[PDB]
RNA sequence: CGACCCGCGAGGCGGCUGGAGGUAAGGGAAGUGCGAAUGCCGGCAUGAGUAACGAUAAAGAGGGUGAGAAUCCCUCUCGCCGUAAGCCCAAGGGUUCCUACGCAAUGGUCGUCAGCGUAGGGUUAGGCGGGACCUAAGGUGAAGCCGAAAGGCGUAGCCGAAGG
RNA sequence: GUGAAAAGAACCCCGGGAGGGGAGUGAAAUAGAGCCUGAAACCGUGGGCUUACAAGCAGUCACGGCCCCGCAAGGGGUUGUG
RNA sequence: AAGAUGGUAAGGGCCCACGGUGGAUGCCUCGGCACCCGAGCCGAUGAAGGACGUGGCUACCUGCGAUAAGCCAGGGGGAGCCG
């Protein structure tokens, strides 16, 4: 009965991604911390083509 | 002498041939096959391979007589299980174990 | 909700199971041949009661 | 047993394997130390398929492994080898200045 | 595995399995001995060969290929959907759609069958949907004002689609 | 975490193949491919004592009947009654 | 005829042998830890870090980039090699 995942593909890219992490002064900490965590290979690129 | 035959890594359960292998202790081999053809209970098909392997071993390689052989001391032992999951109604998952078996028969002369 | 208590012994786990032993079948020989058979059926190697009805014409 | 190693070919003697004898060495590797001073007979199986002949069998695998093959044998086989005194217009001289000298000059024997 | 020594924790000495390391009268230094914390990771039992096999739209028979079939293939009778359990497009999935082999494991049963396992093959646009054409809510933003730093508002212009 | 070396099982015999019995390699395959030694819980197959009028977490302390190791002396397992 | 009346085990126990399941102890280590010393910035001549491609046949790591298991010069090395 609509159990709260309900996928869409432009919403994956317009909130998560590269152009949404390299804009804000608090979101560049996320990339600069996942590049030295122990090298997350990466999560947010689940999107296609 | 002391003809041996072992069926190893055959998957049924080790308590569903304790019902069947107890019917062929102390019998002769001409009458352990007729008691085992018309028996029911799948599990009595795997035991009807190992006597017909042990008969060919005792005839060919170990050089005994042919029709004087009686089945002595047949038994079955355990085997490594393997686990899978069943989902069970509000979350909680369960583990069932599908076990294997080792049937062995030794065979001797009267 | 009706859950048990103390786990049963080996000596009484293996006393219920004393009564589950199964019987061998009953066999007689086909009289036209020389083998076994369950003693009220058509014989699937030698053929009949009185008149064939089976077995590979 | 490295980039630094010894034998090119030559009448190599052996010491301690139940062999105590010696002749030429044939094909030396590096990182395992594999060669052939052919004494070792083994019995490899040959699988009897028509790409092979119908009945071939083993023999020709030896693999004398170690540094165990003591070195080039003049009348004093007891030898290591030093390097040049070079006695010419700048030789390089990889020769046995120890006891006696049948040690790999450009003659009929290599 | 075992009927010599100390009161005790413990030492010896014999008998099988093992396969290359162990030290010792006298001293020194601490991650120094466990049954219990609804203690933590790993095995294995008890309940038990019982409750269950996920819908009250049912099935039956004859010939096939095979080592082997109530369950896989064709022929003939029987029942349920028929405004839907039948065809056509957008989301979303992204491998296996089709053929030739195969059955160890997954299908809560079998299986010679498959959406399962290894190998080979298969989606063709001037004129169909979207870019080299526009703009809406919103976003970004020369100039201009700003806010201890990071940053916040904003004119023309530009990005923005199941709408022109 | 096999073996010093793969020499890691050619070829016959049951089996649809798995898997096994013989040959053969090796100083040894109870060292065979999840393979150095390999314990306890857990589950089995053969031999010794014992029980279907008898009441108890369990055991212990006596006496008798079988079984075994003992040349003989003496000892261990087993449990019927108090 | 009134006898301690007893030799049977669908099954259960204790002890002694012989096998399976399991993975602790012993012996090892191309992997870590803490103190010392040599040393201590790269970047719009476009960085740190990545996508995709490259072996005769290739799934994955390593090396390289349309010249793609590589090319041209200088030195060392002295014999077998095409990760």
Domain segments of chain B: what residues? Answer: 2-110
User: Is the CB of C25 inside 8 Å of chain B's CB atoms?
Assistant: yes
- Select the CATH number that applies to the domain covering B2-110 from these four: 3.90.470.10, 3.40.50.10420, 3.40.50.10800, 3.40.50.300: 3.90.470.10
CA distances from A29 to A33, A35, A41, A45, D74 (A): 6, 10, 17, 18, 75
Q: For chain B, give the longest Cα–Cα distance.
A: 65
Asked whether the beta carbons of B58 and B107 are under 8 A apart, the reply is yes
Residue with tokens 């001797």: B108
- Which residues in chain C have their CB less than 8 angstroms from residue B33's CB? none
Q: Is D1 helix (H, G, I), strand (E, B) or coil?
A: coil
- Which residues in chain C have their CB less than 8 angstroms from residue B19's CB? 20, 22
Nucleotide nearest to D28 (CA to C1'): G80
Contact at CB, C21 and B22, closer than 8 angstroms: yes
Contacting subunits of B (3+ beta carbon pairs below 8 A)? C
- Which residues in chain B have their CB less than 8 angstroms from residue C24's CB? 23, 35, 39
Name every residue whose Cβ is closer than 8 Å to that of residue D92 and which is 6 or more positions away in sequence: D84, D86
Chain B window 13-42, residues with Cβ within 7 A of nucleic strand E? 13, 15-16
Nucleotide nearest to D17 (CA to C1'): F4
Resolution for the entry shown, Å: 3.6
Asked whether the beta carbons of B39 and B85 are under 8 A apart, the reply is no
- Residue B31: closest C-alpha in chain C: C36
User: Is the CB of B26 inside 8 Å of chain C's CB atoms?
Assistant: no
Contact at CB, B19 and C22, closer than 8 angstroms: yes
- Which residues in chain C have their CB less than 8 angstroms from residue B39's CB? 24-25
Tell me the three-class secondary structure of chain A, residue by residue.
Answer: CCCCCCCCCHHHHCCCCCCCCCCCCCCHHHHHHHCCCCCCCCCCCCCCC
> Do B and C share at least 3 CB pairs under 8 Å?
yes
- Strand segments, DSSP code E, in chain B are 3-10, 69-77, 83-87, 93-97, 101-109
Q: How far from chain centre, in Å, is Cα D50?
A: 35
Q: Is the CB of C7 under 7 A from strand E?
A: yes
Quickly give A2 CA vs E164 C1' distance in Å.
36
Q: Is the CB of B11 under 7 A from strand E?
A: yes
Q: What is the DSSP letter of D57?
A: -
d(CA B4, CA A3): 61
What six digits make up the tokens of A24? 């804000």
d(CA D45, CA B86): 49
Residue B21: CB atoms within 10 Å: 21
d(CA B67, CA B58): 11
- Method used to determine the 3D structure: cryo-EM
d(CA C44, CA B110): 32
């Amino acid at each position: 009965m609509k159990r709260t995942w309900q996928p869409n593909r432009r919403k994956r890219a317009k909130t998560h991604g590269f152009r949404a992490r390299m804009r804000t002064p608090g979101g560049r900490k996320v990339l600069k911390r996942r590049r030295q965590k122990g090298r997350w290979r990466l999560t947010p690129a689940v999107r296609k083509r | 002498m002391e003809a041996k035959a072992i069926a190893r890594y055959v998957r049924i359960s080790p308590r569903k041939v304790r019902l069947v292998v107890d019917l062929i202790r102390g019998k002769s081999l001409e009458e352990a096959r007729n008691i085992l053809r018309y028996t029911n209970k799948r599990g009595a098909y795997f035991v009807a391979k190992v006597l017909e392997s042990a008969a060919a071993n005792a005839v060919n390689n170990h050089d005994m007589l042919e029709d004087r052989l009686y089945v002595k001391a047949a038994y079955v032992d355990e085997g490594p299980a393997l686990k899978r999951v069943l989902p069970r109604a509000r979350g909680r998952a369960d583990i069932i174990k599908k076990r294997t078996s080792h049937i062995t028969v030794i065979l001797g002369e009267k | 909700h009706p859950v048990p208590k103390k786990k049963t012994s080996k000596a009484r786990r293996d006393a219920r199971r004393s009564h589950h032993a199964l019987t061998p079948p009953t066999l007689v020989p086909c009289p036209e041949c020389k083998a076994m058979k369950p003693p009220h059926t058509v014989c699937p190697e030698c053929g009949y009661y009185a008149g064939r009805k089976v077995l590979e014409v | 047993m490295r980039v630094k190693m010894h034998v090119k070919k030559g009448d190599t003697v052996l010491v301690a394997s139940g062999k105590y004898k010696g002749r030429v060495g044939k094909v030396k590797e590096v990182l395992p130390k594999k060669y052939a001073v052919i004494v070792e007979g083994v019995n490899i199986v040959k699988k009897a398929v028509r790409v092979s002949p119908k009945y071939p069998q083993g023999g020709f695998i030896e693999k004398e492994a170690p540094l165990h093959a003591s070195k080039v044998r003049p009348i004093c086989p007891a030898c290591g080898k030093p390097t040049r005194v070079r006695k010419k217009f700048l030789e390089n001289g990889k020769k046995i200045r120890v006891c006696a000298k049948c040690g790999g000059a450009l003659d009929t024997e290599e």
